[PDB]
From Swiss-Prot:
The lineage of its organism: Bacteria, Pseudomonadati, Pseudomonadota, Gammaproteobacteria, Legionellales. It comes from Legionella pneumophila subsp. pneumophila (strain Philadelphia 1 / ATCC 33152 / DSM 7513). Residues 155-289 form the Fido domain. It is found in: Secreted; Host cytoplasm. This is Phosphocholine transferase AnkX. The chain holds residues 2 to 477 of 949 of the full protein. The FIDO domain mediates the phosphocholine transferase activity. Transmembrane segments: none annotated. ANK repeats lie at residues 389-418, 422-451. It comes from the Bacteria. Virulence effector that plays a role in hijacking the host vesicular trafficking by recruiting the small guanosine triphosphatase (GTPase) Rab1 to the cytosolic face of the Legionella-containing vacuole (LCVs). Acts as a phosphocholine transferase by mediating the addition of phosphocholine to Ser residues of host RAB1 (RAB1A, RAB1B or RAB1C) and RAB35, leading to displacement of GDP dissociation inhibitors (GDI). Phosphocholination of target proteins also impairs accessibility to GTPase effector LepB. Can act on both GDP-bound and GTP-bound Rab proteins.
């Protein structure tokens, strides 16, 4: 009959998220290993982490307090952006909370942040074609990019599927992690396009029956919002680190912990659902490990006590302290829902996931038990979450520093000479990460093979050998 129906039931997970680890929902997982977790990110824009946390937290409390049913608005979007640059020096001179009129905003996209299906959808966005957006190969310059070609100029819609395949091939040819292709955003009707996207989300979310259907609508609109670059800066933080998390928590889902949230431009809506599910899974893993008092080692990062104390002294968010102390009900329904949501994650590439998340030698032996050669040496293809693309389970075992997985992969006679889309082998990675035991274990194998010299001399896309990297360990 009469009940308390929380606006964002998923706040249970934001309260459950360990305080000392909260920075993980803003600091891309890709940085952790080499930038001492949150340190690199913070130094780049001092106070941006506290402003990002406070933005999400205050705006969530505002929606939770409301008597009205949650709906997206141009006003909520402006409020998020305003808060995301509150004390940030690098955002104060870029009008926080105000939309662009004619200003130019541009960036480059590497093949590693793109997909064929994603480029197809990107070229299909009518607002981009009519709003005068520019995209194509070129050169970065002092006053924006110099386009050699602009695909939006005289664009044939029938050509878009073949153009996408060609664009990806060109981006690939240049280099997986290198930038050749640039995007110059729309310089008119940004206010009008922002309103159309909002009206479209509110319309479509009403006719999405299942969580999976709802997730596709959410990501399709977050993507359109990111692609239409409405603000001078902070669009990633505004749309993906903040905005995205509200409809997620509205559905009783945990917020997202991304490895790489910079895929909201040239990835497809369907591909992004998988990306977001991986990010929700990361949040659940962080929560579960901290609950088990298990030290978190995800994405190659072992936090020191010095790093941990530095973050708590730094942390300043009255809204987060409020969420932390909220009254929290049987979470069984919420757990079943998120487990049902993440059950799909399993099926696709289990060995690559095992190299990232697994650490029990017994669980690893069992996972690798009965896997054929083609499975143990499988390189994931374009369209999957960025971390997998062109990589073998061995590549990810080395990068993650997963000794138990690497040991089992060696026992399974995995091809350690395979190159990823960056021309790097497991040995190039062992050098870069400076792990002597991993490199020693790889070399013992390489030297037992006949093509040892050829293997050791493998050059990556920078024409560097694994040993060029080893010799450079420590800048
Ligand atoms: N201080 C910051 C702020 C943003 N970033 C990068 O920018 C992304 C978000 O882009 P915005 O600047 O559009 O918010 C982050 O996911 C991260 O890759 C960073 O590396 N350090």
């Amino acid at each position: 009959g009469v009940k308390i129906m929380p606006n964002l039931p998923g706040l249970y997970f934001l309260q459950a998220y360990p305080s000392e680890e909260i920075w993980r929902l803003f600091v891309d997982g890709r940085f952790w290993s080499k930038e001492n977790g949150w340190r690199g990110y913070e130094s780049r824009e001092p106070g941006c982490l506290n402003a990002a946390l406070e933005s999400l937290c205050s705006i969530a409390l505002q929606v939770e307090k409301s008597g009205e049913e949650f709906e997206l608005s141009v006003d909520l979007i402006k409020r998020i952006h305003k808060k995301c640059g509150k004390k940030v020096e690098e955002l104060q001179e870029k009008n926080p909370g105000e939309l662009r009129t004619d200003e130019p905003v541009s960036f480059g996209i590497p093949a590693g942040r793109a997909s064929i299906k994603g480029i197809e959808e990107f070229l299909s966005l009518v607002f981009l074609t009519e709003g005068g957006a520019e995209f194509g190969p070129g050169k970065a310059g002092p006053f924006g990019p110099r386009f050699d070609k602009n695909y939006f100029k005289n664009l044939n819609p029938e050509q878009i599927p073949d153009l996408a395949k060609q664009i990806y091939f060109d981006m690939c040819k240049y280099g997986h992690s290198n930038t050749n292709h640039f995007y110059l955003a729309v310089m008119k009707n940004v206010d009008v396009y922002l309103e159309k996207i909002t009206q479209s989300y509110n319309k479509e979310i009403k006719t999405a029956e299942t969580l999976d259907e709802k997730l596709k609508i959410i990501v399709k609109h977050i993507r359109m919002y990111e692609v239409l670059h409405p603000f001078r800066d902070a669009n990633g933080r505004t749309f993906v680190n903040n905005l995205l998390n509200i409809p997620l928590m509205q559905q009783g889902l945990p917020p997202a912990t991304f490895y790489e949230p910079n895929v909201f431009d040239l990835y497809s809506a369907e591909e992004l659902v998988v990306v977001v599910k991986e990010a929700i899974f990361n949040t659940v893993e962080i929560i579960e490990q901290s609950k088990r008092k298990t030290p978190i080692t995800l994405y190659g990062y072992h936090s020191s006590l010095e790093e941990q104390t530095k973050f708590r002294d730094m942390l300043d968010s009255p809204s987060y302290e409020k969420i932390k102390h909220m009254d929290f009900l049987n979470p069984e329904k919420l757990h079943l829902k998120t487990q049902k949501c993440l059950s799909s994650l399993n099926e696709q590439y289990p060995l690559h996931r095992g190299a990232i998340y697994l650490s029990d030698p017994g669980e690893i032996k069992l996972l690798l038990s009965n896997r054929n050669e083609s499975q143990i040496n499988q390189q994931i293809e374009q369209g999957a979450p960025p971390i997998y693309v062109g990589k073998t389970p061995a590549h990810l075992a080395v990068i993650s520093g997963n000794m138990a997985m690497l040991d089992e992969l060696i026992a399974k006679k995995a091809d350690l000479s395979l190159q990823d889309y960056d021309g790097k082998t497991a040995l190039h990675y062992a050098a870069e990460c400076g792990n002597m035991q991993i490199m020693g274990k790889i070399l013992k194998v390489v030297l037992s093979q006949e093509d040892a010299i050829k293997v050791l001399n493998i050059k990556d896309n920078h024409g560097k050998t694994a040993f060029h990297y080893a010799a450079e360990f420590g800048t």
